[PDB]
Design a protein around this ligand. Structure first.
Ligand SMILES: [K+]
Ligand SMILES: [K+]
Ligand SMILES: [K+]
Ligand SMILES: [K+]
Lengths: 292, 292, 292, 292
């Protein structure tokens, strides 16, 4: 469901840039075994931006097939044209995903009123639950609490991935929504803080390579054991930062390959292969988390 | 032609959101008559964000058909996947456009090296002149002068639309590139300053409703008559700011409707109709410019 | 001591700009009666910047005299020259204050190494406890966690007033310091959040006019009753924001006068009297907090 | 004289932090010989922050004594209390300085109206020309063009040192003030751009070690020979940036020592000695400029 440690899973690729089915299966089994609560398929970390709509759908369908009911699957579904968002979401009706992660229109910088209409329209054309995704550093566009409050009144809009790293948002949004609207961090480095303020979990990049620690950290948090949780957190903190030493998902894909979870660390342009210096930095962070 | 007042033309729509050929013809005749140097078809102001590839190609071909050789046309062609930019660009080879305006990958936040390989590859697969477009407020990524210097060495990368509003960039870029590389403002409120520092022109929103004044201002700036160009700029300055009182192209499409240049001011969601307050502000700016 | 609700008390003045002893007594009694834990005398809210050093000392001595052992007194003691900071601190040795609130040098923007030497030197020339005060929006200068960690190793440096409003700081600093280094918020609007993350109290502007609510909110927080605490918080939140609708301490002085706690709302230039529109805004916030 | 290359002169100190009269005389003779238009005594670069009022007056009187009528001297006189600025200013009336450089109140963050009443009052109580100084990175407050327009109507407020590095301000200010109001850059890296937009000169840090080049660059800019001025600016550009590799005036005092212009590079805490790495960077910048 929508709590605990949710992975924004990489889209592993062969040397040609196409999805690697064996690698994907290996990651999906690693999650099922690790206690991960759900998989976000073709989020930002899954290279949503460089997959075409059919390739995106293939990866989601494949991911659901390979999950085989053992672990719920959320699909990335954002578009910055409201009509395109509706169409793309319609594709996944009756597919088996439990929900959609739908990104704020990126680029065209709508007003808060436009954001409200965009998401309200998306929600009205599906029965799938919708998790709003706010990530202003990528989109140029900031979904404010007041607007999240308005959107939470729509039946199937059920939570938000808050990736600003701005922790005052947690309670500004909580005071405006019902007790079962979910609040998930999209910022690994502040996610334990976010849960300590009342957040319900995290859509994590770090969980790609430390799924068990991340799932244990979020059980502890949800139980009120923040000081036990922080010990795992300090173990992971260099990763939470150094998985962004170069643009995501360049580091986390390299790390997945170095840990043997995927066959190649290939990405699509304009993402570039990891630099030597980035490799050493990520290597050190992995050693610190006790994974090499 | 890649100097002077270049308009980033609105894509005029009927009440259903479909391109209105009659309104487009009127705009194009207006720019031919008013001395505009060229037309950017389906840029940001032309709602690039919300047109699919079919409509995008149609608008560009219709603009070329209506222009009928009387004014150069440049297409917006950016994409955040390098493969898709290359592919959209191929579709316009031998179309009759003189050039492409290609935006930095938005959303995925590539490194400078990524940006370099992106634009180099797009350029490698066409004969068309390419104009790089930097607009960090929309893309979350900033093409730096050093990278622009490296890209200018590629034969058909011929200029930049610099939309940061950061005037330091003009001479940082100019000292790294050859004398025939074109520097074009993409920020109307600072465009005269940009030209006085050595910029060659402006790709303008304001030009949609003040074509003649913009063309004369740019010609005066080109000859060095800055005090004279600034008289004109001071009467346009309220438009230069208030055409962004709500998200572009909401205000400018309203203005074009109020002047009678287009039949409706309809846009595509997530752009919303102009508010009553925006209407009052834009109307006062038009009156300050002497257009109403 | 250094926990709970600490007031950054206004320096009430007569129509001529000099300290008003009757008004000060009335505020000090109101605090003693309200449960306020301590008084910061001649902090930022007390107009430290527009009092000369003798006037500053007079206000501190007067405040301690009037407190008459009923409530501990911390003096503002910052200087941006390290020698001047030491001298100014020496004045208060053996005076009766329990500690100093010492601001980061403002203006000259030292390195982190310079900040470390400045504060280490101050601490070495007094036996008074020192609370570091980080407030980058006023000083242009940001004391980072790593540097706070180094400074906390000095015997008499015992806590920090963190006024950035950046809540990730609470745990970044906690993991680098011992369990009895104190962490106090300097940002009223985020202070309950700050305490919920592990902070020990707040040096508050809002407590000037809502001392009892603020003291009750921080007892509840310290006891783990965050949801009871939040109800008081939502009552006060318009105040926490609107006490800065004009520069502090302009609004809070007007509010103190409107509630009858001080005789005049006079301030020293370049602080100006409250605007009409600001008066109505602050009035509304007071009505909301149930104080008019 | 308030045009051309104006140096913000270092205050050279012996090993004990006391003003070194011999080093000061050498600097002053150097600026007379190198064509510098004037000297700003005890500005930011002159460690205004860390001198008390006694030392501040001494340095200014010693500079006037050594200059001996050969070059105009301007004093730094800002304060964040209006009463104290008025008072420091009175101390220099009939001293022989031609003007004051008065900084916006730092730290207390006054409103635009506050700033207006501040500078108007300072100006009302002197016959000396006043030059407003805007440096938001140090003061936390930004004097806006509209306020500058209002202040220019006061008879003896004659110009502004604009240190934001925001080049849009030049023509926003210039259109609101009369033709004899002086606009002076306070940001060396953007100063040539500032002049090309219509600025009249620069109050410069770089001028401390490259006097002659700075004076020639400013004269060429004044006559409109921008391409020629830019050759000089490109050789100074590493200094313009690297003299801030560590907090000003750490690097420039080191540079003056390495050139032999001052006996020691001692500063007052919280400024610290230059690091080994800063030394290497500044030395390479001096060699790029042709000074070593
Ligand atoms: K709902
Ligand atoms: K080229
Ligand atoms: K200590
Ligand atoms: K004047």
């Amino acid at each position: 469901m929508f709590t605990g440690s949710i992975v924004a899973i990489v889209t592993p690729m062969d040397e040609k840039g196409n999805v690697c089915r064996a690698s994907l299966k290996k990651l999906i089994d690693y999650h099922v075994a690790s206690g991960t609560s759900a998989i976000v398929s073709v989020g930002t970390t899954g290279e949503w931006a460089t997959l075409n709509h059919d390739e995106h759908a293939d990866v989601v369908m494949m991911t659901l097939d390979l999950a085989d009911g053992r672990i719920p699957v959320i699909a990335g579904t954002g578009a910055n044209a409201t009509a395109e968002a509706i169409s793309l979401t319609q594709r996944f009706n009756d597919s088996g995903i439990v929900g959609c992660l739908t990104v704020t229109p990126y680029y065209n910088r709508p007003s808060q009123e436009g954001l409200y209409q965009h998401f309200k329209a998306i929600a009205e054309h599906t029965d799938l639950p919708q998790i709003l995704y706010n990530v202003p550093s990528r989109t140029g566009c900031d979904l404010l609490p007041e607007t999240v409050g308005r959107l939470a009144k729509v039946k199937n809009i059920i939570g938000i991935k808050e990736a600003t790293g701005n922790l005052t948002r947690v309670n500004q949004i909580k005071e405006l929504v019902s007790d079962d609207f979910v609040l998930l961090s999209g910022d690994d480095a502040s996610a334990l803080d976010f849960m300590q303020l009342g957040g319900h979990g995290v859509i994590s990049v770090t969980a790609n390579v430390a799924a068990r620690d991340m799932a244990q950290m979020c059980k502890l948090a949800a139980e009120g054991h923040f000081a036990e949780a922080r010990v795992i957190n300090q173990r992971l903190m260099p990763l939470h930062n150094k998985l962004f030493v170069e643009p995501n998902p360049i580091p986390v894909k390299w790390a997945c390959k170095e840990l043997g979870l995927v066959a190649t660390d290939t990405l699509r342009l304009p993402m570039t292969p990891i630099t030597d210096s980035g490799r050493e930095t990520v290597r050190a962070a992995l050693k610190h988390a006790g994974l090499l």
